[PDB]
Symmetry: D2
Subunit: 218 residues, 4 copies
Amino acid sequence: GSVIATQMTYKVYMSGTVNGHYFEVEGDGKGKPYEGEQTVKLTVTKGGPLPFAWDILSPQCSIPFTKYPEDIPDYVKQSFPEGFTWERIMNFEDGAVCTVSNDSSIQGNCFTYHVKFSGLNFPPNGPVMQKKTQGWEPSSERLFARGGMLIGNNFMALKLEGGGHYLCEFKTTYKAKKPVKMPGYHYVDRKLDVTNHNKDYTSVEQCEISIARKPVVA
Amino acid sequence: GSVIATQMTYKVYMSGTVNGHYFEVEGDGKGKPYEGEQTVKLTVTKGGPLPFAWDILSPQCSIPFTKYPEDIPDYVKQSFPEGFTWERIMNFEDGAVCTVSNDSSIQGNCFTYHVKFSGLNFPPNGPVMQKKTQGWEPSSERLFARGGMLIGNNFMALKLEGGGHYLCEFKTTYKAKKPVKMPGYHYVDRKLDVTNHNKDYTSVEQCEISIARKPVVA
Amino acid sequence: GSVIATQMTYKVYMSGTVNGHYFEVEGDGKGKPYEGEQTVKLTVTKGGPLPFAWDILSPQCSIPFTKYPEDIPDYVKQSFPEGFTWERIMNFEDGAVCTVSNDSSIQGNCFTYHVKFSGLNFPPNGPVMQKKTQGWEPSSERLFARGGMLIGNNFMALKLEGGGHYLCEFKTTYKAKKPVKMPGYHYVDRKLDVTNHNKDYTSVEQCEISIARKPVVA
Amino acid sequence: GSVIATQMTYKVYMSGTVNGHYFEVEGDGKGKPYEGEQTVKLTVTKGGPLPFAWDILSPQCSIPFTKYPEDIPDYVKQSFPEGFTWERIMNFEDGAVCTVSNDSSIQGNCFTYHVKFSGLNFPPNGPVMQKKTQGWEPSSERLFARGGMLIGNNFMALKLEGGGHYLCEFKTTYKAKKPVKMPGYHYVDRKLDVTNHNKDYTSVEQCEISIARKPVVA
Ligand SMILES: [Cl-]
Ligand SMILES: [Cl-]
Ligand SMILES: [Cl-]
Ligand SMILES: [Cl-]
Ligand SMILES: [Cl-]
Ligand SMILES: [Cl-]
Ligand SMILES: [Cl-]
Ligand SMILES: [Cl-]
């Protein structure tokens, strides 16, 4: 409540590989953590232009910016100033798999995100390597507590050029760097929109709204 | 609209195996399909008492009873009177796997469900064979259209005796027996409660509420 | 050694569903269990002609007929006369999944196999429903002991019409009906050949050679 | 045949993360590529001592050193001097997942391997984070050709302290940097032994024997 301002900014430092292609990305964002609203601008600082769809990286560029009701303990925020980290597995329906690790720290009014992205087995003629994806459908992450950690499961889906979907299952484990009050079985709905970008996506702007809630039908 | 009364009844005829144990179940239910409210009474007619947790069978005992808004085409209802079928895969976090097939038909004011359940690899000392489960947490099924079919993905979870959860991923493919108007990316929230049962669950009563909706944060 | 003749015969009684299609199969086979050589004739007694590739059922039609060296304890044979059962999960690379349960008993010189097959989510335009498969490539099952059971993992592959492969991962758990001497980490190589069949595969003849061995490079 | 000496040496440059823990490793090895025999010495140059079992990294430290019969085209060797790369997915039975990318180049009598390792979701009280593993059981990789690539599937297993096994499924895709003669359905048996190491595994010596063969029972 005192550790996180109503208006925060954050920096993203991501590096990784996709089918063996190394790359680096830097971002500058801001938003209202208690409102669940945020925005960020990314810049491919190395390895660009990327030979793959930007969409697989968009969800890797900020959990603190999630609107949690008062009756539902905010796992991520509580962890600060200590901070926290998250580990993610992404299984695409065509065999591709990604493992992503994050470390979230805080310094005053700014959050710092260090991210390592590892993605491979993306079919050369698939939607990713052919850049045929058109953003993510809004999602709903199932979250529960286990071993002092918060685990989130999400059935994500990328909109395909000309109609259709490219499926991907998300599993993210959030690990606070200090004991916090564990939440109950809940969900976080999100809508991530790429609001701007250049011709080759070496520059991108993203908009995200994340709101937590109890089961709709309890 | 004319094929399905506001108040319907249905019969369930299920047979199958769990770790090689054959069994048979018969049910009698009713509800308001357009209200998404239903109830059913099950009776283990063969193989009882079952040496496993009833909870794995509860979700196998009625899609027509789902409240769909008017702006979201009801895939299942449209299929009638022709009817439809569904195929389901259940992956429990401890290795157990179940495949379930259903056939839904209609005769006047009564729906008939024929179900075949195949479940195996349930650890002998696990929550299922030890009957340590305590009902399902409310769920949220992600649904989209593909190849004239409706596919649903759900991150289900069984409440464990003494706290904790026993996870299970659901994937259900709904196949209408006739071309129908396909729906867009949506969800169906549910809460399935075992409202009554005898000492050995050879007799069970279930309550279910299923409501469809558009993404909470679009 | 006394419970199993050098020349045995067996009967197969299989029933099940594939994408909701019920069927029944009966078989009559024979072979030399200690030689790992066997043959069997199948007859679709119900639900035929099957609207799917026979190949998915061929591996479901006899572990006792496996040549085990003397330095490697034969898990399956030891279980007799008590017998044993096995549970199997089949994951095809295109999403299809099958769960199979078996019960193996013995009466004199004849083994009796009761089998329940549940398969679904086979794409309508896939190799299975389109009958474009041409038999299994020889396989190698990785076997080890756990909880008094023997678990086998196999990377199977169906030869496709015109070249190529249709992959399927096999996981089989063998459960002896009585405590037996557990084996060490080993393998069983097999070659299953459809030696004869009629136009619509309502009648089939299969040939199988199964030999156990220690790791080739220890 | 002329591009690869009968006696080669190689250098390994690996970096990565495990549950968010960054690390770096350097290796110096040698062996007889056509004999399938090789050895290598690893040194944790950064992030050591590693808080996890070394065994998960041992298989990441040399395909060129595999003995292929003459009747079976050597995919990896043919690719040189152009070289090749490989992408790997590792699924441990307790939920942990690793994605590994490699790039193999050649300069005279020395192979250079650049490796990126990403592993996460290793349970804090599991065999890996608790360093309770004792080397890999010998393995057998199922290999076949697809899309000009060679795909290998392996059912690996880590020996546990006090008996038992910690399972892990391997899937490796080999991508030659130039068109080569594709091989048929075959296998590669291996035995990887940690021949020496210091108290905290910041220094390790490994021995590997890899031999290719046709199906044992064709
Ligand atoms: Cl907890
Ligand atoms: Cl809560
Ligand atoms: Cl459609
Ligand atoms: Cl809609
Ligand atoms: Cl054992
Ligand atoms: Cl042995
Ligand atoms: Cl090819
Ligand atoms: Cl070959």
